[PDB]
Amino acid sequence: FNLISEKCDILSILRDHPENRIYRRKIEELSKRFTAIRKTKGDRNCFYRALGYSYLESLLGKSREIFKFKERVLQTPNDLLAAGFEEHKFRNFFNAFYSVVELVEKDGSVSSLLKVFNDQSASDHIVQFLRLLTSAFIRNRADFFRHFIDEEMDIKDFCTHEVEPMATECDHIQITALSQALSIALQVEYVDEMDTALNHHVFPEAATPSVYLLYKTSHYNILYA
Ligand SMILES: *CC(=O)NNC(=O)C[C@@H]1CCS(=O)(=O)C1
Prior knowledge:
Layout: E1 8-9, H1 21-30, E2 36-38, H2 46-59, H3 63-82, H4 87-106, H5 110-118, H6 120-140, H7 142-148, H8 155-162, H9 172-182, E3 186-190, E4 199-203, E5 211-215, E6 220-224
Parallel strand pairs: 3-5
Antiparallel strand pairs: 1-2, 2-6, 3-4, 5-6
Bound molecules: the ligand *CC(=O)NNC(=O)C[C@@H]1CCS(=O)(=O)C1.
């Protein structure tokens, strides 16, 4: 369980910041709304790895939701081709993601899904797929990302340097783009060391979340309501 842990009690993370007044306060507050947490490895890939695992776990046993998600995943090669990616270069990554969606359908256990996401090879193939899809979706909607995020940013360079490579840290743009690309609604809880309110953001603004994440160190862990 070196990439995604077993589930633990929310207060078990007090030991990560002992004798830190503000962290203890915010984690005690968080424990009033959430019951459990999984930790993720802090290797620069944890946003992609955590969102992929938590969303697929939320689909287990839901036959209509699985059918609709598979239908969207089967169209994602078209997104990649429209952005200029070549099939022979994304095939191995697409195939790995499609395989784990079929596991959700056919096997349906938490145990088997957690084993794939802790297999360094399968899990890193899945992460690389999600990074190419994120880049494709931004490139195909460049005017949207300039209008609503940052009129001055260089979209092609940003995707090349901060989205596609393994181990590159995320910001708000990648979260928004992958949420929209796969129709995943997620809520992020923000825990920093300032004497401020524990707060959160939903992606997209209006939606009922399927996934909850805890953000603290440039790091994302998985929460359970
Ligand atoms: C989501 C993800 O992989 N985050 N990366 C880390 O947690 C890296 C740590 C935060 C600062 S560091 O790079 O020194 C260790």
